[PDB]
Design a protein around this ligand. Structure first.
Ligand code: NAD
Ligand code: NAD
Ligand code: NAD
Ligand code: NAD
Lengths: 371, 371, 371, 371
């Protein structure tokens, strides 16, 4: 089997979907690894480091996409890449299909077989391949939120943690999962007063236990959500139902009642946004205004700390990459139920129910492709 | 007596030297309070809020400077203000005289009588008027340091706290006083591994006690400083000898051997900078490069979070402002040795020994002006 | 049924496989309990204490081995005990068969039926009978490691926790399971800077959550493993694949590049050792040298704190002892899949797959012995 | 002035009274530094390291003692060194004179001028040169106490921290000063339940605040002392009255009522011992028995971790060494009242009142030697 990794083309995307250690393991097992030259440059991995591990460097993107049986990526295919999608080829990357009909249609029309990092799910309900990017983004959201709270950046001009005698910032985190817990933890470490909302009370119990009383928890009812968002300096949206679109929890009329200069960071923007006003932005133009608040909506957040995120991602992905490479996609998916649950696309068939329900028709096929 | 507060004119300076509560106290005691129109706008204090407390609003800066016996500021007089300096007037603000020959010269030449906030010193050695601004700055340094470590900003692209399985950022703080303790505390809260250096072992003992083992402490010898700074992702300089220039502890050749994309935040920039390459910068152009590292040297740091810092500052200054207004400068200074230590300038005489020795001649007069 | 407990014969083994409370439960249910006189003396349990609970005291070891249907021990049979092994007898103890061809062969040849404490495994993957001994050994490892770091015992002469102004010891723990978590917790409590490595990222996540940032986590790749071990003063090997031999993770060539006087504690020595140079030692001669480092390799660790470890063990084992005594071995194993997983040996058949593949041939039989 | 450092001669004493950084400072100021060849070897400081800093290496001890105006040591002169004591020479070291009539007499008869590290005391009551050795010894006491609690070393066989479901060791620390606070902190970090006693309630308050409820505090009356010691597994004596002999707080009759295998560590053994049965031991024979308990009585404790303790000591002593070298002993003592408090001996006169009243006659002279 032939494994390809191309350079990420999305705006400011510095991650790469493999490191030399991973190349070494693949080649040890007799697979060939093709890598677009310069693909690891964002993450400070030279073409030479890749070579030394047994990779064949290739001059252009086109030659990675043709040739490769298993295409490993970080982000979803962008428009300019739709034409590179092949019929007898496995695509393994973050897809976020429920948020992009165009990407979904491009996968279905090309007949490619695709597996989403973010829907790979173990029996206990964890998402081990999203988890590490949720950790990075949760932590990032508190830092960038803290920074944009300065007057100098258009925020209301309060210091996260206050100083003795003077009140700290008021931070609300919607969602007590991986990203939410990490956002809350960092925000609390900077001295903010932190409140997190979720519909799952057990998630609130764990948070309550972990910090004794320090992080406040509220049940995420409409009343309770409005009360907290109204008073907040910084709101972080970190909500998920694993493969689904993402509920609109904060309306524009709500934001109209917020303190001027408040900042809202929508981690749930890949996947759709959990604020009504959310729209994907980029690291070049990260923010925009909604009634006197400032919105921060970068899809692709982990990309700005590639030294951390590249390693965090590939430590998690490799064992699945190896299962795919050794056994081919079906069989890997028959042996590994968590990998099966990541199956999204095959020969024009939409294999994920949540995506299908949210996208209107398509219509599912379950996993009678697994025969 | 007549108390004047003008609008701050330094770049991006949003603080104001008094709040309504302070105005009300002054007025209740029979003093007149003159305030430049719009002085509190940066801090969200309206001209109307100031009136309600008993202040006379004045259309121009010039009328505040002429007329006021006691002039309250936040920052030092800047060049455009040198001509406003008067002979029979008390100026109470942050001066940082050892770092500016020009400003010292202008104070001497005008015959003004000046008290520096930053050299008001209690018997125990504390600096109660600097302390709140060192708190804000120390906490800001960690925040802005974390942000500039993103590849997106020119930094090396590591997340402060790392994520499980991946190392965190390596933070070194030079100086374990108010600013350095606070920078250390926030850096630690964001999950960084933190080392602080000082020549004062007792300061190191306190920090060791407060965080059990969590914050590492190193005795600040040349060898220990070089070792730590070489390995650092973020270096925060927080050194002071109370009225003095500030030693150059980190040489350019040392920074030549640092990791590419490291960031150095020099909180000791007012006062002169403790890195050899430091130079005062502004919120409009905060950073610049030195051999592949990024330097951050905003004099003026607390200005960006005025909602926090204006209150933190005036909570501390008000009792001293009251002593000055009720009794006049000599007598206030005869009564309160902490105030006497802040005496910098009177009728062409330099009253501060540290400033004097550092500025070359001038030559001290001690406080036989207190008669 | 008749239950026998002999005196432990291994070097410095002070534990006993049962306490008076356990004897009393067995007796209440109509079983006979035979105990070698003096078996509880290492753990401060007198012959009289055992009598009061309903035990028959027996003068010699031989009479316990013959006579007893269920033989409860703490350690594996040693060579002088091979001749005591009988055909229609249940042996329940720590076995570690993958580390001893001889002990395995002796059980096979004797036809005895044996269940290993260390492979009794519940549905969630936990090893409830190993666990309390991993807690003791993990906590012991940090203690004894701390001690042998003194120059006086051959170590490099650094204090675990340092003192303010001076760096602490650098501790690496390989394996984030029960013993690793416990070693890290105590090492950290003593002020050391602690890094733990594992291939299981979820175990890294738990450890990151429990101590906030305080215990560092590193993904266990060969590169990360080398980096960390090279810099360490104390290395603790706590790696564990349930019934298997144990990977050699630290080569002799690697130890040759370690700081002189470093100490390596191999908790995984029962089971084979995870350092290349490891070899079982005893409490009489616990350490030996390997290239200027000091190895500590006591199989048997919990034996030195029997007041703690005898109770910790028997609190966990008793419910399983009761099921075996009441129902006999098959039936107990038919009803309790956790107990079935501990089945090692019966009438010349090796019942553990991991042991079988590690020992070369033998060849498995699965549990068609359960009929 | 000429400064000499000889090799420490006490049993297992691996510390050295100076480091290369200290030699370099002395040399820079125009002083001569003479060092016995091999003096730094216990602390891994080579003869070459000392040369590079400007030191003259000397072949024998005798030549350091003759020749040197200022003689810097770590331990007190031992008997084989009494003949080396000279008239016009400053001795600066740990003395513990109230515990040795012989050493005192030898200093008196020789006419030497001696300053004790342990009685150098600042205005606030702190002992800055003792302090770093009390930190090391306090942390060591918990480590070595933990170790000797193993049955394998004669202790009762309880693990410091217990394990879930089983009780931890019960630790009592007598004295809540530097060593006591440090012993408690490490004991607690290892999971023991820790009670500390002192007659100074404010020290009890500090310790209650620092650990919230976690470290128990008891007022040290005879009733409370007996109650706590009777129930303890580990007792640490850390009591300290600055220059005095040290009260016998724990009688032999009391130890007769202790649990068998209990361990008593007498940190206050330099200075005389605070247990009736205490007697100075060495690292070669650290322990002895007293009524079924085990006593640990190493005078000299910090010597086993010289990598830590040499730096901790010399970081504190250097500024005082510099004052002595530059100005000579009187003058240094006239300028620095803290140094004056360390004055012990001059031309046959005993200058310490506490030592004098404890040793019976001698008789004080105060510091009319300072003229
Ligand atoms: N592109 C990026 O920069 C990036 C990176 C990582 C994660 N994310 C996104 O962050 C979001 C959350 O990620 P995660 O891994 O923490 O998910 P998670 O599965 O761990 O947590 C989701 C949590 O949100 C909660 N939730 C669902 N509906 C809710 C509601 N109506 N009100 C309050 N809480 C609700 C759930 O109960 C759950 O506890 C996802 O949309 C994910 O895609 C984005
Ligand atoms: N303009 C601003 O944005 C701003 C605001 C606040 C404070 N500051 C500056 O921050 C600096 C720190 O102020 P602070 O209140 O924390 O001071 P502080 O007096 O409380 O502490 C300073 C510490 O530096 C240590 N130090 C002195 N010399 C040293 C050396 N050579 N090596 C290592 N440590 C040394 C001292 O021992 C002391 O503990 C000052 O320069 C102050 O002016 C700037
Ligand atoms: N005889 C004794 O004194 C004594 C007592 C108790 C336990 N032990 C030994 O301690 C060892 C650890 O036991 P435990 O109960 O903690 O086991 P555990 O299963 O709870 O955890 C072991 C950990 O090792 C990790 N691991 C496996 N392979 C790894 C790899 N190659 N790199 C890094 N990590 C890896 C696993 O992921 C797991 O998290 C076992 O060998 C056990 O027998 C010895
Ligand atoms: N040689 C060594 O290895 C070594 C090293 C360092 C310290 N020490 C010894 O440790 C002892 C403690 O030193 P330290 O630096 O912690 O002293 P310290 O002065 O900081 O504290 C000693 C404490 O003992 C308390 N104390 C005095 N009388 C008491 C009484 N009768 N009952 C209860 N508490 C009482 C004091 O109140 C004080 O808080 C000293 O003897 C010191 O010499 C030995």
């Amino acid at each position: 089997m032939r494994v390809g990794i191309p350079t990420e083309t999305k705006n400011n995307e510095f991650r790469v979907a493999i490191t030399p250690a991973g190349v070494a393991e693949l080649t040890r097992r007799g697979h060939e690894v093709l890598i677009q030259a310069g693909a690891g440059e964002g993450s400070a991995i030279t073409d030479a480091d890749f070579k030394a591990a047994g990779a064949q460097l290739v001059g252009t993107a086109d030659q990675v996409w043709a040739d490769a049986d298993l295409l490993l990526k970080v982000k979803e295919p962008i428009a300019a890449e739709y034409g590179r999608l092949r019929h007898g080829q496995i695509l393994f990357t973050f897809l976020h299909l429920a948020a992009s009909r165009a990407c979904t249609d491009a996968l279905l029309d090309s007949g490619t077989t695709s597996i989403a990092y973010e829907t790979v799910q173990t029996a206990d309900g964890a998402l081990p391949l999203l988890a590490p990017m949720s950790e990075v983004a949760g932590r990032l959201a508190a830092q960038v939120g803290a920074y944009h709270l300065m007057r100098t950046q258009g925020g209301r001009g309060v210091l996260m943690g206050g100083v003795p005698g003077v009140e700290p910032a008021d931070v609300v985190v919607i969602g007590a999962g991986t990203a939410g817990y990490n956002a809350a933890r960092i925000a609390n470490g900077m001295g903010a007063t932190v409140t997190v909302l979720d519909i799952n009370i057990d998630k609130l119990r764990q948070l309550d236990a972990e910090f004794c009383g320090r992080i406040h928890t509220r049940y995420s009812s409409a009343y309770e959500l409005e009360g907290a968002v109204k008073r907040a300096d910084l709101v972080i949206g970190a909500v998920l139902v694993p493969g689904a679109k993402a509920p609109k929890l904060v309306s524009n009329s709500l934001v109209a009642h917020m303190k001027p200069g408040a900042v809202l960071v929508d981690i749930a923007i890949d996947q759709g946004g959990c604020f009504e006003g959310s729209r994907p932005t980029t690291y070049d133009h990260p923010t925009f205004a909604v009634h006197d608040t400032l919105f921060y909506c970068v899809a692709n957040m982990p990309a700005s700390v590639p030294k951390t995120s590249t390693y965090a991602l590939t430590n998690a992905t490799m064992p699945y990459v190896l299962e795919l490479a050794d056994h081919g996609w079906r069989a890997a998916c028959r042996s590994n139920p968590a990998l099966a649950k990541g199956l999204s696309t095959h020969e024009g068939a939409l294999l994920s129910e949540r995506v299908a329900t949210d996208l209107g028709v398509p219509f599912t096929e379950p996993a009678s492709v697994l025969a």
